[PDB]
Write a protein that binds this ligand. Structure first.
Ligand code: PCW
Ligand code: PCW
Ligand code: ACP
Ligand code: CLR
Ligand code: NAG
Ligand code: NA
Ligand code: NA
Lengths: 272, 976
């Protein structure tokens, strides 16, 4: 009626305001067991993935050197990520710490608590990425038939990689370098991949261990990953070539269902 | 064919109407032609559907159209997804299983109405039937298939009538109804000269001519004309149709609202199309026909165990809605084992021992009054003891006669000596068997006394009609005319002997003078011959008819449950009232208009009729009213006792009662009651003491020949509707907790809380076995305190049930699942507020470094695995929130502390099935990630338990105020 609707619209106000108060009163109780510094579990991200920077869409790098617009997105997307590694964005010394030019042991910056507050990151220099830093060549190699991808290991909080104790690198330094090796996925791709040139820190083809462990976006904002740049200086023209890059270690794991866990696959095609 | 039967005509023109002969029948050349014209005459059931249309109708029907629409939508979604060059094949499995669901429901439907039919086929009564007889003038064995018009058939007692014939020659044949050669009644059912196919023939030889064959027969009619008869929808079918309409309306409204929201808010067609199939697979109760056909079979078995042999299905569905019961007195309401306790002669009341007397009568046996009365009682009795068992006491000896006759035999044998010799001395020539119409048992005896009277006539019957035909009374061995001092004495004695609730019988005798009646005489039943008036009434026999022990409890439960009880006995309106007050039909503090006039000490007409609530109306009283007066009598007065009523007037009583929007349940045991046993909504045939005609015309058969079975049939007929409202509520509860996740996924952009295959696994696993487990529930405490259900006003699924299933418990099963979902996501890195508007980046196969709340970077397959774990957690949360949603659905007014958690042990099977399926789906089907399931940590099972110990508390405190505060806006509003 006109007067008993106020008694049915008032029960459903209190009941639905009590359900909301119980749902919110339990989400804030669950969140009391969730730390703001480290994740409760590392089960899905524990074995880090390994990815390339150009953020290529369908695992296919296809472009034509004589067309400035086929590789325009490829070249313009590397710049966005390498802007934060610019030597002019690392001048601040209150945040950045200058480690050596040679790999060393993992740098422990303390414990996962509020002591020391903000922690000091270790700066990475572009010019270690010779021919791929962009300090000399504005296009990172795509102007010619020399694509250059930049490999990065996915950030895992508190994770310290352990390099192995494939072929030996002949410049081993395994105590402080995590090896990365890019090779053709098939025999008909190994025969056609040609020459692969890596550009890492200190002439070592891998991720130095002195940038680990990561401390997680609150203790370490402005954190710069170690990068490995791979250039294919001579590959078959007008062909789709499959290339698989792997990081070797005893922390690093590989999965038959996750195609990007410790590995990645990129199909490089250069058209003429 | 035709609605009229040719029976008024005499034999000469009955021969002309169909071309027959009374004696010789017809020759072969004509009989064969007539048989070819008419055809065979037999009763067979073979008509049935071609069953292809039946498989087609069971293939799509009710919920199946919606599910087929959903399957088509799923196929369209798959082809649209394949247009985008991506094929995860998750839609193929969903569509295949969805079609398999309809295939299995069709298989289960073929299982249905087969095991129920097998249960139905067991509820049926036979009669000794044979089709062999020797007939047609010359004594030849002729099969019943050759019986046709123009052929005369001579029948003998002990079998059924070979064909629907009109009797032309007969000698006192009897059927269950006198058979004669003369037209008696216009109606062919009672014309007394027509034989009925498949009807028993007691005794005697009768000859008749076939008048109908096959479709022309009254019983057959359109039996061989195919067509659809009996396909009327059962009440549960109507409720299921209403439920289907409600479900379709809700689903259509939700889909239309979401589509009108998505068309303007830029949601691409795939999301809308997959939401419609989610809605279709969610809001469709699949395992409902199984738990519907289980409940009816279970209730049929329960009533068959409670002596309630319900035959039809419309009877078991409609029994629980009974409102009016028109029961009998002898039989249903009384033990039908009378004991003689009081005697009346010389205007005095003499008591006697009911049982275990073991001694002679207290009064003197040499009295002149007692000698003649005892001699007549011994002579007039027809009861005989059980042969071959003359070692057991008198009580244990059985008689195939009337129970009253057993009573007089028990009295006479324990008081007097041998009665066989006296009966042999008083040779009997003819005797009229006792019948309800005449209400007397006339006998003819030849006098062996030295005075050659040679004619002795002795009969017994109702004392009122006995003295109404008598003009004298006998005292101290001297005859005197019936003066007022004798009529008033008889009236007072009858009132005193009926006040305690006992029936009485009169006795008379007379010797015909020798001068008027010679030694040799011929006795005819039809001819009056010997006078039957002004006989020598002697005394009265008083015999106690105690009601059965359980009857008063049944009559009180009928009063509590709002079921009106009416008596249709044919006894005096004094004894009927005095026994109704004893059994509770006429309750205490109730007064008929005559008794309130007596209390006011004024005449009846000077008393307002509204001041009386009871009514004891004689048969002629309602014989003199138009139907409007009968309707107003049945409306204004609560307790009505139709005493002194004709057995046929049950027709009038039932047809008047049915015009009050009420369901009547009359109980009759005779072929006279069969027309009234057919008009009633639930006709009831008396079980042990009953005729096969009644058991064939009744919708329900007793097996304890007792009242309190008609009420324990109602008490479990109500259980069907009580346990269906508990089965259609638990199913509907988990229906908005399966489509809310997708609504929030579309709106807020959270990663998919639950998949599409998961909300189908919920319906398949944790919605079927617990649904069946609620059909085994026992009765509540208020089942016999509720008014009878109205067929039109009340529905199985009302608005409040659906609102409480969707808006109350369905919204608490979503808030508990979302807590576990947020717990699973937050403990791996993604905080609750980091998940908003994340679905676009979450489902991009190219972003393999998505950054969580701690800065870590996740590949695509790991996000996929976390989403699978989050959906498994939602599924587990609504498997545990539906364990406290099956405990609280075992009741609608009581608590578990009263009903008992362990009294129904199929609830535990349903709970174990839920737990086992949930453990198989996450640890057996999650070890290899498939169908969106992954292994679940031990914490993620008990997170939703606090929200399950909330649904139970809320319902317990909802029912507590229903119990404490009836009709206080809480019983009015919050009661499903
Ligand atoms: C019909 C449907 C029935 C079922 C519906 C179930 C709910 C589904 C809704 C999903 C939408 C998203 C819900 C988000 C829940 C947030 C919970 C909360 O409270 O987070 C407070 C946040 C901060 O948390 P954090 O991420 O920093 O904690 C991280 C851990 N630590 C504390 C260590 C840092 O504060 C802030 O960000 C403030 C800024 C953002 C504010 C957003 C407010 C959203 C609240 C929604 C509640 C709606 C309730 C609906 C109830 C319906 C009943 C019928
Ligand atoms: C009376 C009848 C029983 C009723 C029980 C009700 C409560 C049931 C709910 C949870 C109890 C779970 C019991 C089993 C748990 C076993 C494991 C455990 O003990 O897990 C506790 C977890 C927190 O684990 P952790 O941080 O210690 O792990 C640290 C791991 N490391 C050290 C590697 C970082 O608690 C969590 O999951 C968060 C749980 C949030 C629940 C909110 C409920 C709000 C209601 C109030
Ligand atoms: N063999 C017999 N000979 C004469 N009278 C008999 C008889 N058997 C019964 N009666 C009479 O029938 C009366 C008993 O009534 P009864 O119990 O038959 O009523 P009823 O049950 O048939 C009415 P309804 O069928 O409508 O319930 C007695 O008063 C008695 O006089
Ligand atoms: C989801 C929230 C916002 C709902 C708000 C509206 C609610 C309170 C309204 C909308 C529809 C309403 C119902 C509509 C019809 C019926 C049936 C009637 O016999 C009793 C009232 C009852 C049971 C109403 C109860 C109140 C009701 C459920
Ligand atoms: C690449 O590096 C080599 C030295 O390692 C140098 O000789 C060559 O000029 C470089 N090419 C480009 C395109 O910079
Ligand atoms: Na459901
Ligand atoms: Na359900």
């Amino acid at each position: 009626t006109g007067g008993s609707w106020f008694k049915i619209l008032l029960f459903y106000v209190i009941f639905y305001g009590c359900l909301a108060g119980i749902f919110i009163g339990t989400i804030q109780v669950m969140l009391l067991t969730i730390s703001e510094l480290k994740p409760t579990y590392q089960d899905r991200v524990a074995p880090p993935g390994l990815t390339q920077i150009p953020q290529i869409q369908k695992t296919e790098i296809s472009f034509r050197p004589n067309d400035p617009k086929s590789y325009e997105a490829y070249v313009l997307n590397i710049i966005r990520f390498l802007e934060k590694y610019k030597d002019s964005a690392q001048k601040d010394d209150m945040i950045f710490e200058d480690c050596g030019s040679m790999p060393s042991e993992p740098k422990e910056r303390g414990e996962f608590n509020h002591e020391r507050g903000e922690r000091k990151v270790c700066r990475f220099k572009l010019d270690w990425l010779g021919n791929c830093s962009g300090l000399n060549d504005e296009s990172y190699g795509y102007k010619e038939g020399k694509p250059c991808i930049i490999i990065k290991l996915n950030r895992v909080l508190g994770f310290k990689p352990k390099p192995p104790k494939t072929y030996p690198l002949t410049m081993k330094y395994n105590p402080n370098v995590l090896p990365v090796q890019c090779t053709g996925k098939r025999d008909e791709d190994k025969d056609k991949v040609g020459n692969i040139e890596y550009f890492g820190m200190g002439g070592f083809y891998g991720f130095p261990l002195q940038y680990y462990p990561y401390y997680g976006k609150l203790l370490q904002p402005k954190y710069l990953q170690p990068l490995l740049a791979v250039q294919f200086t001579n590959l078959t023209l007008d062909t789709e070539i499959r290339i698989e890059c792997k990081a070797y270690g005893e922390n690093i794991g590989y999965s038959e269902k996750d195609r990007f866990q410790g590995r990645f696959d990129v199909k490089i095609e250069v058209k003429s | 064919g035709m609605d009229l039967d040719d029976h008024r005509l005499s034999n000469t023109e009955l021969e002309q109407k169909y071309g027959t002969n009374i004696i010789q029948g017809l020759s072969s050349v004509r009989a064969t032609e007539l048989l070819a014209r008419d055809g065979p005459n037999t009763l067979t059931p073979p008509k049935q559907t071609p069953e292809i249309i039946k498989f087609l109708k069971q293939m799509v029907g009710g919920f199946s159209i919606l599910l087929w629409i959903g399957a088509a939508l799923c196929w369209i979604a798959f082809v649209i997804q394949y247009v985008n060059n991506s094929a995860s094949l998750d839609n193929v499995y969903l569509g295949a299983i969805l079609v398999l669901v309809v295939i299995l429901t069709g298989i289960f439907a073929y299982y249905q109405e087969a095991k129920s039919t097998n249960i139905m086929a067991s509820f049926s009564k036979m009669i000794p039937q044979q089709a062999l007889v020797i007939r047609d003038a010359e004594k030849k064995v002729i099969s019943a298939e050759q019986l046709v018009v123009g052929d005369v058939v001579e029948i003998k007692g002990g079998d059924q009538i070979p064909a629907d014939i009109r009797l032309v020659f007969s000698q006192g044949c009897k059927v269950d109804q006198a058979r004669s050669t003369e037209f008696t009644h216009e109606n062919p059912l009672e014309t007394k000269n027509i034989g009925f196919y498949s009807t028993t023939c007691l005794e005697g030889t009768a000859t008749g001519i076939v008048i109908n064959t096959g479709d022309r027969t009254i019983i057959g009619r359109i039996a061989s004309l195919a067509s659809g008869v009996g396909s009327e929808k059962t009440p549960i079918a109507i409720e299921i149709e209403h439920f289907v309409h409600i479900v379709a309306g809700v689903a259509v409204s939700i889909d239309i609202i979401f589509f009108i929201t998505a068309v303007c808010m830029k949601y691409y067609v795939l999301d809308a199309i997959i939401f419609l199939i989610s809605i279709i697979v969610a809001n469709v109760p699949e395992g409902l026909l199984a738990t519907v056909t289980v409940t009816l079979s279970l209730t049929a078995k329960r009533m068959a165990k409670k002596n309630c042999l319900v035959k039809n299905l419309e009877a078991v569905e409609t029994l629980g809605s009974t409102s009016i019961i028109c029961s009998d007195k002898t039989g249903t309401l009384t033990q039908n084992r009378m004991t003689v306790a009081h005697l009346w002669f010389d205007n005095q009341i003499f008591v006697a021992d009911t049982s275990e007397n073991q001694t002679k009568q207290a009064f003197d046996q040499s009295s002149g009054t007692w000698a003649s009365l005892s001699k007549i009682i011994t002579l007039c009795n027809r009861a005989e003891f059980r042969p071959g068992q003359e070692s057991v006491p008198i009580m244990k000896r059985t008689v195939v006669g009337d129970a009253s006759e057993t009573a007089l035999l028990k009295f006479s044998e324990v008081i007097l000596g041998d009665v066989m010799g006296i009966r042999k001395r008083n040779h009997k020539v003819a005797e009229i068997p006792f019948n309800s119409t005449n209400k007397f048992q006339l006998s003819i005896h030849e006098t062996e006394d030295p005075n050659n009277k040679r004619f002795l006539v002795v009969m017994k019957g109702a004392p009122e009609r006995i003295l109404e035909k008598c003009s004298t009374i006998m005292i101290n061995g001297q005859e005197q005319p019936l003066d007022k001092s004798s009529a008033d004495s008889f009236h007072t004695a009858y009132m005193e002997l009926g006040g305690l609730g006992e029936r009485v019988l009169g006795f008379c005798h007379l010797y015909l003078p020798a001068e008027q009646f010679p030694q040799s005489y011929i006795f005819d039943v039809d001819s009056v011959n010997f006078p039957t008036s002004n006989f020598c009434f002697v005394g009265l026999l008083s015999m106690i008819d105690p009601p059965r022990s359980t009857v008063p409890d049944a009559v009180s439960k009928c009063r509590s449950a709002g079921i009106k009880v009416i008596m249709v006995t044919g006894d005096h309106p004094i004894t009927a009232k005095a026994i109704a007050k004893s059994v509770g039909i006429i309750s205490a503090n109730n007064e008929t208009v005559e008794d309130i006039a007596k209390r006011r000490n004024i005449a009846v007409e000077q008393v307002n009729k509204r001041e009386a609530k009871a009514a004891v109306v004689t048969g002629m009283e309602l014989k003199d009213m138009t139907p409007e007066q009968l309707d107003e009598l049945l409306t204004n007065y609560q307790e009505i006792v139709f005493a002194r009523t004709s057995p046929q007037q049950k027709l009038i009583i039932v047809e008047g009662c049915q015009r009050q929007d009420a369901i009547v349940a009359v109980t009759g045991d005779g072929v006279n009651d069969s027309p009234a046993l057919k008009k009633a909504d639930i006709g009831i045939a008396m079980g042990i003491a009953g005729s096969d005609a009644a058991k064939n015309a009744a919708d329900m058969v007793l097996l304890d020949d007792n009242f309190a079975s008609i009420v324990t049939g109602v008490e479990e007929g109500r259980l069907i509707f009580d346990n269906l409202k508990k089965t259609i509520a638990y199913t509907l509860t988990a229906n908005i907790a399966e489509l809310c996740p997708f609504l929030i996924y579309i709106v807020a952009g959270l990663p998919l809380p639950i998949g599409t295959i998961t909300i189908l696994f919920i319906d398949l696993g944790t919605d079927i076995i617990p649904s069946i487990a609620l059909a085994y529930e026992k009765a509540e405490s208020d089942i016999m305190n509720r008014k009878p259900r109205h067929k039109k006003k009340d529905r199985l699924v009302n608005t409040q049930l659906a609102i409480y299933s969707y808006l109350h418990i369905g919204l608490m099963q979503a808030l508990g699942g979302f807590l576990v979902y947020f717990t699973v996501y937050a403990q791996q890195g993604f905080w609750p507020t980091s998940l908003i508007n994340l679905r676009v980046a979450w489902e991009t196969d190219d972003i393999n470094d998505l950054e969580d709340s701690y800065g870590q970077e996740w590949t695509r397959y790991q996000r996929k695995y976390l989403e699978w774990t989050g959906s498994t957690a939602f599924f587990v949360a609504i498997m545990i929130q539906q364990i406290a949603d099956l405990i609280i659905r075992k009741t609608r007014r009581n608590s578990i502390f009263q009903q008992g958690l362990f009294r129904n042990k199929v609830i535990w099977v349903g709970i174990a099935s839920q737990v086992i399926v949930a453990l198989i789906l996450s640890y057996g089907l999650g070890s290899v990630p498939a169908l969106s399931f992954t292994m679940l940590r031990v914490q993620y099972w008990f997170v939703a338990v606090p929200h399950a110990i909330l649904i139970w508390v809320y319902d317990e405190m909802r029912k507590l105020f229903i119990r404490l505060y009836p009709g206080s806006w809480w019983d009015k509003n919050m009661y499903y």
